[model samples]
Target: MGPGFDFAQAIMKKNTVIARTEKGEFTMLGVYDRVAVIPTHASVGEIIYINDVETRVLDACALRDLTDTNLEITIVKLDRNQKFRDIRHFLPRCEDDYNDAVLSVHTSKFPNMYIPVGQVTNYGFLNLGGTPTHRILMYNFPTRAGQCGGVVTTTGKVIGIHVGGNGAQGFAAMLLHSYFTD
Candidate 1:
């Protein structure tokens, strides 16, 4: 389900990061142009390939006033290696590899933001889907390779971090920030 336990552990060890919650100034990392990993049947010693992944915030406490709605946010990283894991081989094949891959959304809180996947610049994404089973148009932009994940905001509170900006799509976002909030 990961890049192998040791590989993942090793990678995370050298790549892991921490920050002081006190008055210390903070720094962040960035998601690579494309890359990610989602739990799957694929096991250890397997080589998977993934490109762009839209990282989003999940496990949200119901918005106080709107119990019917849950809020999500997006975050980015300055260190690309620390933010994403490669998982391309696991992606389900779509009709048009270049322009017609239907991005998926998961209520499980792993990968939800729509990845803007494509080969050409204009071949990017228009709208992302989310809000659990209910897919809706979210982001629209022609973000190509090596751009950046979009920021997810709910009532001025950032919750999710998108990673599929440049054609290649992946769920490289994190949700730790949203956890401490609301």
Candidate 2:
């Protein structure tokens, strides 16, 4: 809505990239926007597939656990270091909760990816097949299990990162507002 923020104009050409790990394959979103600050919980040596192209991660930093929440995110730096190729932009700060509709860009088993929009119903502790963890929950959201690192946005700005899912309840690591702003 603002001069510096345009949904269609700010996003990279290809927003979702496949990340290959020893565990298996998963999706990584917001790659083009956060080339210098790509966040993940994966190890540094992990490989990510962008547009079906291969690139190994050289570094991962800026670790931030969601306080009491079980999810953790790290800022990533690739070995290739072709930062210029990435479409850079300032991500919007996080909010305590969002009741309005939000967009989720992810890959699924249907052979076609879906960018489903849903409403934020609640925010609390949830389990990602692990112990009871905490995160902002969005009901009516449709996303596959492999879309772990996908991006979640509202009002043309990033609000969270997809971490895990259970049924229609999609759990996201809420973006730390302070991480982007002092």
Candidate 3:
């Protein structure tokens, strides 16, 4: 931002944020009504830096949640002064919808900020359990490690965070709208 720009609102405008933590740093997908979320890769009781702004995890993902619709995400709140938007609707259940979903993280690969990745190939479940998350997967290019909570951008509704990866078509978690029952 230039000289008089409101950095706080810049984050709202993007709906994606840079998060700092004691563990592997991650991204904060969106903040709605002062509430936001991130992956549990970061620990609890820690003050997280979102886009260099300070916030604390209100509730973290439990071990049991891994097997639930909520994979590995935690909750946090912004100050009342910080106005934010409501959660975007989940990316609809359209398999093989090839409209190109963009991965915006703001990434560790960048400077002090998190940045978006190359491009996501398609939308599908990263489910390893009895449930499915209808989410993000990479097949096109190399995404840097540890962007676990990046936002997925589609022409349809906005999907949520990603966790791990394998190869180019790799590790990510489409932390569901169910987890985002804020």
Root-mean-square deviation per candidate? 16.9, 4.9, 6.3
Clashes of each: 34, 1, 11
Write the residue-wise lDDT of candidate 3 on 32-128 in tens digits.
Answer: 6666676655664546676666776554443324445544556666453565566535434432333444555555564333334445555555663
Ordering by lDDT: 3, 2, 1
After best superposition, candidate 2 residue 147: deviation in angstroms? Answer: 2.7
Candidate 3 residue-wise lDDT at 104: 52
Candidate 1 residue-wise lDDT at 100: 25
The TM-score, computed over Cα atoms with residue i paired to residue i, of candidate 1 is 0.21
lDDT for each of the candidates? 0.26, 0.52, 0.53
lDDT of 2 by residue, 1-182 (tens): 33222442234235545555554555454444344333344443566554456777665664535474444566665555343333334354444555444443434442233354556645766655665555455656655666666666555456667666666666776665455431
- When summed lDDT is taken over every stretch of 10 residues in candidate 1, the lowest stretch is 39-48
Error of 3 at 87 (Å): 3.4
> Which is better, 1 or 2, measured by TM-score?
2
Which consecutive 10 residues in model 2 have the weakest lDDT in total? 1-10
* Inter-residue clash pairs, candidate 2: 126-133
In terms of lDDT, model 1 sits at 0.26
